[PDB]
Write a protein that binds this ligand. Sequence first.
Ligand SMILES: O=P(O)(O)O[C@H]1O[C@H](CF)[C@@H](O)[C@H](O)[C@H]1O
Ligand SMILES: [Mg+2]
Length: 448
Amino acid sequence: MTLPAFKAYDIRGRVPDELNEDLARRIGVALAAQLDQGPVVLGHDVRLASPALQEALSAGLRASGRDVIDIGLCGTEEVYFQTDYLKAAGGVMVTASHNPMDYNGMKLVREQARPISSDTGLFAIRDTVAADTAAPGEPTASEQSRTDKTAYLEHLLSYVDRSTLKPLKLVVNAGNGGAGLIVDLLAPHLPFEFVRVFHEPDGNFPNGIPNPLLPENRDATAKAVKDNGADFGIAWDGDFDRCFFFDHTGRFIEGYYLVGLLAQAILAKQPGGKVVHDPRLTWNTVEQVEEAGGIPVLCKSGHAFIKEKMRSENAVYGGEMSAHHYFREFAYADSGMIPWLLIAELVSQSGRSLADLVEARMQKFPCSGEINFKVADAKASVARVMEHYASLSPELDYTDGISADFGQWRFNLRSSNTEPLLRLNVETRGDAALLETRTQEISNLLRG
Ligand SMILES: O=P(O)(O)O[C@H]1O[C@H](CF)[C@@H](O)[C@H](O)[C@H]1O
Ligand SMILES: [Mg+2]
């Protein structure tokens, strides 16, 4: 009935039955009709099928009279950056994120790298592609190759004071995705000693598809940090718009705590700024932002909502617990590079370990981590939870699912916009025992 590849925030599907060169050319034609005037920026990740999908995208765009700026093999944040930097009408990143090997996809943005989502253009594109039986026209526009990263690289380096940086030893783990190319281009401008793990891009993924959240991939970075006495370690997903931190003990840092740490880091530079955060886990961020002089701003989870709220608020920084970090100067877009530059600067400047920068906060606001439930009836399961806790009279907020605040503990429970899942997050005021008993209680009710 509808094309499955078109999801709430991007396109993704198995090649070639859900996504192929014909659909990609048709997407290019339909994208040309949705955008304002200007050229379109295209880039792609390390997957084997990605270049051919970009070529068809370009073929459909140029047949519709759009100039194409091919920035080549890149990270997703480079499409965002170059789209805004070159004042393009739009951009497309061909990337499969971390879906299986036979999969690929696309992330589409319009002017200033504003996201194009299901309800803001993507389903309009889908419907056009679905009905398009027109003969493929011929290109009436040019393609320029623009692989110079100087402006991008300079913008990354502008977030830190290079004269304050220490020669930290940093484990870097590209997972054979694309992040290692950017690390190597930054390295002549930085004092750090890099320990490079799974560094070379390989779309065949000899060491697994890049996903630092899976414990086996987690351990490769952790062991490299411990084995080398590194100050900390960093891992990326394949298109490296997500980054993941490992302290000097090898412990993976739960992304929740990076939001408050990056907020204080940014607020030191831009006093009194607003900081956008999501509703899943809040107490630590609210406190760290306020203590650093900032103003926290609650916002629905999801990069489209985060970006739009950041724009309306002139917020300097936005952070999600799911390893997405957004920066006003970066076209309000997410970066997998800016966050570790900022953390390295903080470690260099404060003389404190990454471990110690987060340890007191992890003690003060222990959290469950996101816990996903595939249930027979999401709506019924949520009702069993709320009915159980009704007699306690929690403070309820519906910005994003249901947030219930009981005083010493709170939870958020939502349905995913990208998967038919229920997602659960719990945190407490310095009480690990209460965190475990309440998490287990909620889990049993959801599973019921
Ligand atoms: O939880 P979801 O499935 O609805 O959304 C997930 O993908 C979004 C886009 F990448 C993120 O912005 C959310 O923070 C993340 O949680
Ligand atoms: Mg990614």
